[PDB]
mmCIF file of C-alpha atoms in Angstrom:
data_model
loop_
_atom_site.group_PDB
_atom_site.id
_atom_site.type_symbol
_atom_site.label_atom_id
_atom_site.label_comp_id
_atom_site.label_asym_id
_atom_site.label_seq_id
_atom_site.Cartn_x
_atom_site.Cartn_y
_atom_site.Cartn_z
ATOM 1 C CA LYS Y 1 1.053 0.021 -13.418
ATOM 2 C CA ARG Y 2 1.953 1.521 -9.772
ATOM 3 C CA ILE Y 3 4.348 -1.353 -8.870
ATOM 4 C CA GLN Y 4 5.955 -1.124 -12.288
ATOM 5 C CA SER Y 5 7.422 1.727 -10.760
ATOM 6 C CA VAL Y 6 10.486 2.277 -8.702
ATOM 7 C CA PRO Y 7 12.617 0.967 -7.068
ATOM 8 C CA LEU Y 8 12.542 -2.411 -8.344
ATOM 9 C CA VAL Y 9 15.886 -4.470 -8.050
ATOM 10 C CA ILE Y 10 17.638 -6.845 -10.692
ATOM 11 C CA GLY Y 11 17.714 -10.592 -11.259
ATOM 12 C CA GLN Y 12 17.893 -12.867 -14.145
ATOM 13 C CA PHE Y 13 15.324 -15.420 -15.868
ATOM 14 C CA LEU Y 14 16.085 -18.592 -15.765
ATOM 15 C CA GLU Y 15 13.162 -20.982 -17.367
ATOM 16 C CA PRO Y 16 9.535 -21.154 -16.741
ATOM 17 C CA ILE Y 17 6.921 -23.683 -15.022
ATOM 18 C CA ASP Y 18 3.944 -22.718 -16.029
ATOM 19 C CA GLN Y 19 1.808 -20.100 -18.374
ATOM 20 C CA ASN Y 20 1.649 -17.819 -15.221
ATOM 21 C CA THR Y 21 4.870 -18.483 -13.591
ATOM 22 C CA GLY Y 22 8.544 -18.658 -13.369
ATOM 23 C CA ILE Y 23 11.945 -18.877 -11.721
ATOM 24 C CA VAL Y 24 14.962 -16.344 -10.930
ATOM 25 C CA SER Y 25 18.445 -16.409 -9.401
ATOM 26 C CA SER Y 26 18.877 -13.219 -8.293
ATOM 27 C CA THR Y 27 22.223 -11.394 -7.710
ATOM 28 C CA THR Y 28 21.148 -10.785 -4.259
ATOM 29 C CA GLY Y 29 22.497 -14.407 -4.262
ATOM 30 C CA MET Y 30 19.602 -16.821 -3.719
ATOM 31 C CA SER Y 31 17.151 -18.625 -5.909
ATOM 32 C CA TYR Y 32 13.280 -17.855 -5.889
ATOM 33 C CA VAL Y 33 10.154 -19.001 -7.590
ATOM 34 C CA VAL Y 34 7.834 -16.288 -8.655
ATOM 35 C CA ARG Y 35 4.730 -15.303 -10.874
ATOM 36 C CA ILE Y 36 5.268 -13.341 -13.890
ATOM 37 C CA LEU Y 37 2.028 -10.849 -14.687
ATOM 38 C CA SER Y 38 -0.016 -10.750 -17.364
ATOM 39 C CA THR Y 39 0.007 -7.501 -19.876
ATOM 40 C CA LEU Y 40 3.392 -8.989 -20.603
ATOM 41 C CA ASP Y 41 5.174 -10.605 -23.738
ATOM 42 C CA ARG Y 42 6.585 -14.179 -23.307
ATOM 43 C CA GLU Y 43 8.318 -14.815 -26.155
ATOM 44 C CA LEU Y 44 11.471 -12.702 -24.887
ATOM 45 C CA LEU Y 45 12.411 -14.476 -22.087
ATOM 46 C CA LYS Y 46 13.366 -18.115 -22.330
ATOM 47 C CA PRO Y 47 17.289 -17.846 -22.121
ATOM 48 C CA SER Y 48 19.421 -16.272 -19.013
ATOM 49 C CA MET Y 49 18.046 -12.932 -20.116
ATOM 50 C CA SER Y 50 17.824 -9.426 -17.839
ATOM 51 C CA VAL Y 51 14.447 -8.576 -15.664
ATOM 52 C CA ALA Y 52 13.223 -6.489 -12.860
ATOM 53 C CA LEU Y 53 11.620 -7.536 -9.644
ATOM 54 C CA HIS Y 54 9.343 -5.864 -6.820
ATOM 55 C CA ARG Y 55 11.593 -5.955 -3.885
ATOM 56 C CA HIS Y 56 9.643 -7.097 -0.803
ATOM 57 C CA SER Y 57 7.560 -9.699 -2.338
ATOM 58 C CA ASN Y 58 10.614 -10.462 -4.901
ATOM 59 C CA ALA Y 59 7.821 -10.357 -7.486
ATOM 60 C CA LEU Y 60 8.555 -10.014 -11.313
ATOM 61 C CA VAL Y 61 7.370 -6.602 -13.291
ATOM 62 C CA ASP Y 62 8.842 -6.006 -16.445
ATOM 63 C CA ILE Y 63 11.803 -6.965 -19.160
ATOM 64 C CA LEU Y 64 14.405 -4.512 -19.621
ATOM 65 C CA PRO Y 65 16.965 -5.050 -22.923
ATOM 66 C CA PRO Y 66 20.112 -2.361 -23.673
ATOM 67 C CA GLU Y 67 35.941 -2.491 -33.028
ATOM 68 C CA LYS Y 68 34.687 0.889 -34.876
ATOM 69 C CA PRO Y 69 37.188 0.770 -38.182
ATOM 70 C CA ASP Y 70 37.217 3.577 -40.251
ATOM 71 C CA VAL Y 71 38.744 2.779 -43.568
ATOM 72 C CA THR Y 72 37.469 2.219 -47.232
ATOM 73 C CA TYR Y 73 38.509 0.769 -50.635
ATOM 74 C CA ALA Y 74 40.116 4.329 -51.431
ATOM 75 C CA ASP C 1 -16.435 -8.484 25.138
ATOM 76 C CA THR C 2 -16.795 -7.994 21.586
ATOM 77 C CA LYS C 3 -17.846 -6.071 18.605
ATOM 78 C CA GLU C 4 -15.282 -3.301 19.771
ATOM 79 C CA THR C 5 -15.180 -0.626 17.105
ATOM 80 C CA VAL C 6 -12.271 1.465 17.586
ATOM 81 C CA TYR C 7 -12.768 4.677 15.803
ATOM 82 C CA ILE C 8 -9.957 7.087 15.018
ATOM 83 C CA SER C 9 -9.838 10.566 14.104
ATOM 84 C CA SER C 10 -7.597 11.514 10.762
ATOM 85 C CA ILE C 11 -6.209 14.153 12.319
ATOM 86 C CA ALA C 12 -5.000 11.502 14.982
ATOM 87 C CA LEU C 13 -3.763 8.896 12.421
ATOM 88 C CA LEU C 14 -1.103 10.660 9.826
ATOM 89 C CA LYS C 15 0.189 12.030 12.869
ATOM 90 C CA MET C 16 1.108 8.307 14.209
ATOM 91 C CA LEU C 17 2.579 7.612 10.547
ATOM 92 C CA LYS C 18 4.931 10.985 9.751
ATOM 93 C CA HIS C 19 6.756 10.900 13.521
ATOM 94 C CA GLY C 20 5.978 7.015 12.789
ATOM 95 C CA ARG C 21 8.109 6.938 9.594
ATOM 96 C CA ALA C 22 10.049 9.724 10.094
ATOM 97 C CA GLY C 23 12.235 8.030 12.627
ATOM 98 C CA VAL C 24 13.346 4.858 10.133
ATOM 99 C CA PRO C 25 14.891 2.596 10.276
ATOM 100 C CA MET C 26 14.787 2.872 14.122
ATOM 101 C CA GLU C 27 11.397 2.373 15.379
ATOM 102 C CA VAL C 28 9.644 4.710 17.382
ATOM 103 C CA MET C 29 6.937 5.611 19.827
ATOM 104 C CA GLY C 30 4.117 7.793 21.257
ATOM 105 C CA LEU C 31 0.894 8.322 23.077
ATOM 106 C CA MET C 32 -2.497 8.076 22.505
ATOM 107 C CA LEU C 33 -5.383 10.299 23.424
ATOM 108 C CA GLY C 34 -9.138 9.712 23.700
ATOM 109 C CA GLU C 35 -12.015 8.574 26.019
ATOM 110 C CA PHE C 36 -13.692 5.298 26.779
ATOM 111 C CA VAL C 37 -17.339 4.958 26.731
ATOM 112 C CA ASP C 38 -19.314 2.094 28.075
ATOM 113 C CA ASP C 39 -17.882 -0.806 26.112
ATOM 114 C CA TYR C 40 -17.907 -0.455 22.499
ATOM 115 C CA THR C 41 -16.582 2.573 20.691
ATOM 116 C CA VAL C 42 -13.019 3.429 22.669
ATOM 117 C CA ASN C 43 -12.571 6.222 20.291
ATOM 118 C CA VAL C 44 -9.177 8.196 19.718
ATOM 119 C CA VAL C 45 -8.779 12.261 19.685
ATOM 120 C CA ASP C 46 -5.146 13.106 19.063
ATOM 121 C CA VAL C 47 -1.470 11.588 19.755
ATOM 122 C CA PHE C 48 2.044 12.783 20.531
ATOM 123 C CA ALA C 49 5.452 11.435 21.121
ATOM 124 C CA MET C 50 7.604 11.245 24.168
ATOM 125 C CA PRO C 51 11.253 11.394 23.861
ATOM 126 C CA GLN C 52 13.010 8.215 23.561
ATOM 127 C CA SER C 53 16.381 6.191 22.062
ATOM 128 C CA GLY C 54 15.204 4.555 19.086
ATOM 129 C CA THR C 55 17.343 1.442 17.205
ATOM 130 C CA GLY C 56 15.979 -0.691 14.472
ATOM 131 C CA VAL C 57 14.510 -3.317 17.442
ATOM 132 C CA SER C 58 14.037 -1.359 20.718
ATOM 133 C CA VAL C 59 13.275 1.861 22.255
ATOM 134 C CA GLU C 60 12.109 3.381 25.581
ATOM 135 C CA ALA C 61 10.611 6.581 26.947
ATOM 136 C CA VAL C 62 13.877 8.370 27.992
ATOM 137 C CA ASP C 63 11.775 11.590 29.764
ATOM 138 C CA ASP C 64 9.215 10.919 32.207
ATOM 139 C CA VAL C 65 7.666 14.811 32.066
ATOM 140 C CA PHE C 66 7.412 15.630 28.671
ATOM 141 C CA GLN C 67 4.163 13.985 28.608
ATOM 142 C CA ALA C 68 3.033 15.360 31.864
ATOM 143 C CA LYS C 69 4.603 18.650 31.527
ATOM 144 C CA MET C 70 2.490 19.096 27.958
ATOM 145 C CA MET C 71 -0.823 17.736 28.900
ATOM 146 C CA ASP C 72 -1.255 20.377 31.884
ATOM 147 C CA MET C 73 -0.133 22.927 28.711
ATOM 148 C CA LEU C 74 -2.833 21.648 26.973
ATOM 149 C CA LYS C 75 -5.576 22.206 28.789
ATOM 150 C CA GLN C 76 -4.966 26.013 28.619
ATOM 151 C CA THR C 77 -6.619 25.478 25.318
ATOM 152 C CA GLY C 78 -7.791 22.115 26.340
ATOM 153 C CA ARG C 79 -8.021 20.849 22.539
ATOM 154 C CA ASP C 80 -8.125 17.408 23.670
ATOM 155 C CA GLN C 81 -8.920 15.046 26.462
ATOM 156 C CA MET C 82 -6.872 12.806 29.013
ATOM 157 C CA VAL C 83 -5.087 9.692 28.020
ATOM 158 C CA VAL C 84 -6.647 6.398 26.894
ATOM 159 C CA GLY C 85 -3.571 4.617 25.419
ATOM 160 C CA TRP C 86 0.012 4.249 23.887
ATOM 161 C CA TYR C 87 1.275 2.914 20.619
ATOM 162 C CA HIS C 88 4.852 1.945 19.003
ATOM 163 C CA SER C 89 6.107 0.692 15.538
ATOM 164 C CA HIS C 90 7.916 -2.015 13.967
ATOM 165 C CA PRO C 91 8.987 -0.439 11.089
ATOM 166 C CA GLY C 92 9.382 -3.332 8.461
ATOM 167 C CA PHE C 93 8.428 -6.294 10.759
ATOM 168 C CA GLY C 94 4.929 -7.336 10.996
ATOM 169 C CA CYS C 95 2.202 -6.269 13.042
ATOM 170 C CA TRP C 96 2.618 -7.569 16.311
ATOM 171 C CA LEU C 97 3.832 -7.708 20.306
ATOM 172 C CA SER C 98 6.659 -9.041 22.462
ATOM 173 C CA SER C 99 7.627 -9.584 25.457
ATOM 174 C CA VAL C 100 8.353 -6.352 26.271
ATOM 175 C CA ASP C 101 5.420 -4.499 25.257
ATOM 176 C CA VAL C 102 3.416 -7.141 27.547
ATOM 177 C CA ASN C 103 5.146 -6.142 30.686
ATOM 178 C CA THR C 104 4.775 -2.465 30.039
ATOM 179 C CA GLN C 105 0.845 -2.960 28.578
ATOM 180 C CA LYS C 106 0.758 -5.086 31.852
ATOM 181 C CA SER C 107 0.956 -1.849 33.693
ATOM 182 C CA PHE C 108 -1.442 0.258 31.957
ATOM 183 C CA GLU C 109 -4.585 -2.708 31.878
ATOM 184 C CA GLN C 110 -3.814 -2.786 35.602
ATOM 185 C CA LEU C 111 -3.664 0.708 35.917
ATOM 186 C CA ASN C 112 -6.953 1.193 33.913
ATOM 187 C CA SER C 113 -8.938 -2.030 32.392
ATOM 188 C CA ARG C 114 -9.538 -1.266 29.033
ATOM 189 C CA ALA C 115 -6.552 0.877 27.765
ATOM 190 C CA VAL C 116 -5.068 -0.115 24.309
ATOM 191 C CA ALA C 117 -1.918 -1.111 22.223
ATOM 192 C CA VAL C 118 -1.557 0.081 18.666
ATOM 193 C CA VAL C 119 0.979 -1.483 16.034
ATOM 194 C CA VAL C 120 1.706 -0.058 12.500
ATOM 195 C CA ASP C 121 4.323 -0.941 9.992
ATOM 196 C CA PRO C 122 5.137 1.979 7.933
ATOM 197 C CA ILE C 123 7.372 0.581 5.430
ATOM 198 C CA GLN C 124 4.994 -2.132 3.868
ATOM 199 C CA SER C 125 2.588 0.648 4.376
ATOM 200 C CA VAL C 126 2.190 1.179 0.898
ATOM 201 C CA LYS C 127 -0.759 3.588 -0.552
ATOM 202 C CA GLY C 128 -3.485 0.966 -0.349
ATOM 203 C CA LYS C 129 -3.166 -2.071 2.002
ATOM 204 C CA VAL C 130 -2.256 0.182 5.046
ATOM 205 C CA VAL C 131 -1.467 -3.095 8.026
ATOM 206 C CA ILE C 132 -2.404 -0.790 11.429
ATOM 207 C CA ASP C 133 -3.483 -3.038 13.945
ATOM 208 C CA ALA C 134 -4.602 -2.421 17.957
ATOM 209 C CA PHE C 135 -4.683 -4.614 20.864
ATOM 210 C CA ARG C 136 -6.090 -5.279 24.560
ATOM 211 C CA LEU C 137 -4.462 -8.142 26.677
ATOM 212 C CA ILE C 138 -6.164 -10.645 28.413
ATOM 213 C CA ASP C 139 -6.169 -12.494 31.861
ATOM 214 C CA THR C 140 -4.612 -15.491 30.953
ATOM 215 C CA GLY C 141 -5.534 -16.151 35.228
ATOM 216 C CA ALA C 142 -9.330 -15.717 33.990
ATOM 217 C CA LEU C 143 -8.330 -18.022 30.933
ATOM 218 C CA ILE C 144 -7.434 -21.192 33.035
ATOM 219 C CA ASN C 145 -10.882 -20.395 34.580
ATOM 220 C CA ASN C 146 -12.629 -20.628 31.103
ATOM 221 C CA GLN C 147 -17.348 -13.561 23.920
ATOM 222 C CA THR C 148 -18.931 -13.398 20.718
ATOM 223 C CA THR C 149 -22.732 -12.022 20.350
ATOM 224 C CA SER C 150 -24.193 -12.244 17.056
ATOM 225 C CA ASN C 151 -21.298 -10.530 14.808
ATOM 226 C CA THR C 152 -17.782 -11.195 14.995
ATOM 227 C CA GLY C 153 -16.066 -9.795 11.165
ATOM 228 C CA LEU C 154 -12.974 -9.889 10.703
ATOM 229 C CA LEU C 155 -10.308 -12.133 11.347
ATOM 230 C CA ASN C 156 -6.500 -12.335 10.259
ATOM 231 C CA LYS C 157 -5.127 -15.060 8.311
ATOM 232 C CA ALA C 158 -1.246 -14.170 9.070
ATOM 233 C CA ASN C 159 1.236 -12.577 11.491
ATOM 234 C CA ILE C 160 2.304 -15.983 12.824
ATOM 235 C CA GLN C 161 3.039 -15.201 16.421
ATOM 236 C CA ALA C 162 -0.168 -12.737 15.833
ATOM 237 C CA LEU C 163 -1.985 -15.913 14.550
ATOM 238 C CA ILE C 164 -1.087 -18.724 16.508
ATOM 239 C CA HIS C 165 0.472 -16.427 19.333
ATOM 240 C CA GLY C 166 -1.886 -13.827 18.616
ATOM 241 C CA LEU C 167 -4.570 -15.222 21.045
ATOM 242 C CA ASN C 168 -3.023 -17.377 23.506
ATOM 243 C CA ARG C 169 -1.826 -14.649 25.499
ATOM 244 C CA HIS C 170 -1.263 -11.231 23.239
ATOM 245 C CA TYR C 171 -4.939 -9.718 23.028
ATOM 246 C CA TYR C 172 -8.826 -9.889 21.735
ATOM 247 C CA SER C 173 -7.469 -8.755 18.791
ATOM 248 C CA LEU C 174 -10.127 -5.972 17.400
ATOM 249 C CA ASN C 175 -11.106 -3.965 14.504
ATOM 250 C CA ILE C 176 -10.921 -0.373 13.742
ATOM 251 C CA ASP C 177 -12.467 2.031 12.022
ATOM 252 C CA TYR C 178 -12.308 6.263 10.745
ATOM 253 C CA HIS C 179 -14.102 9.112 11.492
ATOM 254 C CA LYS C 180 -14.214 10.842 8.054
ATOM 255 C CA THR C 181 -16.516 13.945 8.770
ATOM 256 C CA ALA C 182 -17.658 15.906 6.042
ATOM 257 C CA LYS C 183 -16.401 18.905 7.850
ATOM 258 C CA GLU C 184 -13.142 17.677 7.423
ATOM 259 C CA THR C 185 -13.377 15.379 4.119
ATOM 260 C CA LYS C 186 -14.034 19.186 2.512
ATOM 261 C CA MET C 187 -10.343 20.445 3.807
ATOM 262 C CA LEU C 188 -9.126 16.801 3.471
ATOM 263 C CA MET C 189 -9.619 16.363 -0.295
ATOM 264 C CA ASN C 190 -8.854 20.207 -1.156
ATOM 265 C CA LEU C 191 -5.240 19.081 -2.551
ATOM 266 C CA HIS C 192 -6.677 17.210 -5.572
ATOM 267 C CA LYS C 193 -8.599 20.114 -6.438
ATOM 268 C CA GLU C 194 -6.395 21.290 -9.659
ATOM 269 C CA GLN C 195 -6.828 24.626 -10.494
ATOM 270 C CA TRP C 196 -9.340 26.733 -12.130
ATOM 271 C CA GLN C 197 -6.913 26.704 -15.190
ATOM 272 C CA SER C 198 -6.387 23.349 -15.201
ATOM 273 C CA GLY C 199 -9.153 22.498 -17.881
ATOM 274 C CA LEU C 200 -8.165 24.672 -20.763
ATOM 275 C CA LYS C 201 -4.720 24.607 -21.156
ATOM 276 C CA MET C 202 -4.584 23.773 -24.658
ATOM 277 C CA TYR C 203 -0.729 22.015 -24.303
ATOM 278 C CA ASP C 204 1.702 22.135 -27.044
ATOM 279 C CA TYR C 205 0.800 20.118 -30.260
ATOM 280 C CA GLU C 206 4.443 19.427 -31.360
ATOM 281 C CA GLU C 207 4.015 16.652 -29.487
ATOM 282 C CA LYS C 208 0.691 16.012 -30.363
ATOM 283 C CA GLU C 209 0.746 15.085 -34.420
ATOM 284 C CA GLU C 210 3.962 13.307 -33.670
ATOM 285 C CA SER C 211 1.737 11.265 -31.344
ATOM 286 C CA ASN C 212 -1.083 10.653 -34.228
ATOM 287 C CA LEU C 213 0.627 9.786 -37.596
ATOM 288 C CA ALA C 214 2.967 7.992 -34.705
ATOM 289 C CA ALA C 215 0.384 6.287 -33.432
ATOM 290 C CA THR C 216 -1.606 4.646 -36.793
ATOM 291 C CA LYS C 217 1.715 3.364 -37.579
ATOM 292 C CA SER C 218 1.509 1.512 -34.373
ATOM 293 C CA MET C 219 -2.065 0.363 -35.382
ATOM 294 C CA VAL C 220 -1.126 -1.623 -38.432
ATOM 295 C CA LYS C 221 1.025 -4.094 -37.293
ATOM 296 C CA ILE C 222 -1.215 -5.286 -34.696
ATOM 297 C CA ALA C 223 -4.090 -5.067 -37.352
ATOM 298 C CA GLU C 224 -2.063 -6.827 -40.005
ATOM 299 C CA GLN C 225 -1.559 -9.661 -37.937
ATOM 300 C CA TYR C 226 -4.726 -10.069 -36.705
ATOM 301 C CA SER C 227 -5.635 -10.208 -40.723
ATOM 302 C CA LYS C 228 -3.014 -12.928 -40.428
ATOM 303 C CA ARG C 229 -5.034 -14.358 -37.428
ATOM 304 C CA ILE C 230 -8.348 -15.363 -38.969
ATOM 305 C CA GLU C 231 -6.554 -17.385 -41.920
ATOM 306 C CA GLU C 232 -9.345 -20.356 -41.046
ATOM 307 C CA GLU C 233 -9.207 -20.827 -37.548
ATOM 308 C CA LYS C 234 -11.216 -24.242 -37.537
ATOM 309 C CA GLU C 235 -7.877 -26.399 -37.386
ATOM 310 C CA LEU C 236 -7.635 -30.076 -35.158
ATOM 311 C CA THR C 237 -9.836 -28.796 -32.303
ATOM 312 C CA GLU C 238 -12.560 -26.238 -31.119
ATOM 313 C CA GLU C 239 -10.226 -25.926 -27.806
ATOM 314 C CA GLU C 240 -7.352 -26.323 -30.837
ATOM 315 C CA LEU C 241 -8.931 -22.759 -32.339
ATOM 316 C CA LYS C 242 -8.230 -21.833 -29.103
ATOM 317 C CA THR C 243 -5.209 -23.394 -26.787
ATOM 318 C CA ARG C 244 -2.904 -23.655 -30.003
ATOM 319 C CA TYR C 245 -3.184 -19.538 -29.627
ATOM 320 C CA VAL C 246 -2.011 -18.437 -26.300
ATOM 321 C CA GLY C 247 -2.613 -15.046 -25.446
ATOM 322 C CA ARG C 248 0.434 -13.616 -26.211
ATOM 323 C CA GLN C 249 -0.477 -10.051 -26.924
ATOM 324 C CA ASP C 250 -3.642 -10.814 -28.157
ATOM 325 C CA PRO C 251 -4.484 -8.416 -31.145
ATOM 326 C CA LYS C 252 -7.723 -7.315 -31.541
ATOM 327 C CA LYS C 253 -8.163 -5.745 -27.838
ATOM 328 C CA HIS C 254 -4.564 -3.994 -28.239
ATOM 329 C CA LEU C 255 -6.055 -2.044 -31.678
ATOM 330 C CA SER C 256 -8.914 -1.304 -29.231
ATOM 331 C CA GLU C 257 -7.359 -0.084 -26.474
ATOM 332 C CA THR C 258 -5.569 2.281 -28.550
ATOM 333 C CA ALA C 259 -8.398 3.346 -31.027
ATOM 334 C CA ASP C 260 -10.890 4.342 -28.384
ATOM 335 C CA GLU C 261 -7.831 6.558 -26.829
ATOM 336 C CA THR C 262 -6.341 8.367 -29.201
ATOM 337 C CA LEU C 263 -9.607 9.083 -29.989
ATOM 338 C CA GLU C 264 -10.617 9.804 -26.377
ATOM 339 C CA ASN C 265 -7.522 12.028 -26.283
ATOM 340 C CA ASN C 266 -7.903 14.063 -29.802
ATOM 341 C CA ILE C 267 -11.748 14.918 -29.270
ATOM 342 C CA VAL C 268 -10.769 16.778 -26.377
ATOM 343 C CA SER C 269 -8.028 18.480 -27.914
ATOM 344 C CA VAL C 270 -10.444 19.997 -30.843
ATOM 345 C CA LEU C 271 -12.998 21.085 -28.646
ATOM 346 C CA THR C 272 -10.785 22.558 -25.865
ATOM 347 C CA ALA C 273 -9.378 24.832 -29.284
ATOM 348 C CA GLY C 274 -12.781 26.246 -30.170
ATOM 349 C CA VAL C 275 -13.865 26.743 -27.006
ATOM 350 C CA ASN C 276 -10.527 28.882 -26.232
ATOM 351 C CA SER C 277 -10.768 30.465 -29.281
ATOM 352 C CA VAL C 278 -13.862 32.338 -27.549
ATOM 353 C CA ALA C 279 -11.666 33.346 -24.791
ATOM 354 C CA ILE C 280 -11.743 36.156 -26.946
#
């Protein structure tokens, strides 16, 4: 749970290859293979979601998720 | 020429890091004090810093006297002894030596034939896996002329030019240890002693109930899907009773991990109260 703390680095999931390994094309520019950790969902990742990585390893850590009409029939 | 422990005094180390880290990104260099022994325990006592022009990749000692004006200023207290070696720092790059390091190290050894270099890498040196290492150069002259005794212990499998170059000219790489005594470990751990107030502070409740009838809400949804997850489970194979259900949030554990927890932190909240009651 320690490394899951700061200072992380962002990325962008692309696709899996195994029960415990996926890939990323981060914002830094390049593409890296990387292993997800357990204690973590899987159901919520396959698209180009948003993610968070561990800097030096370039590992993976945890997930992160996120006009006004005013009228009425009277 | 093996089995050479290198004990270090804990007063020495943390000074090596602090000045070894405060100068980051630009690297940094100081000295070691200690004393050789017959062959094995080349201990260390205390360190200090020569002034210097530090870069991210290079540095020298500017002044050639602040190390000499200070030993002569130390023996008035005599809190240490003579010199035994010198360290330096590679801030994010790994632990090894370079062609500059040897040229200066090659002076110390011929000056005194057991002196030692030390290398440190504070950036990747996390609260766990420190990576410090030390080195004694060889005589490649003695090599082309062409040692273990019943124990060797530890070798590295990384730091490439400490792993394929780390022998042919670098050094008879050599382990380290720590002289953590009782007289100091007592004064060492005196941080984490919380306080004599720090075991009867019945903190506010306005999160407690907001956790209690919040937690049970988080129990059911994993329970009643574990209620689903026992439907028959004898389906199409013994492995099909296992591998059709990946470990994506295995439910029964997940409730037990909180079952015990909410029990374990509430039982203290109730007990602590009745004890605090008899403060009066």
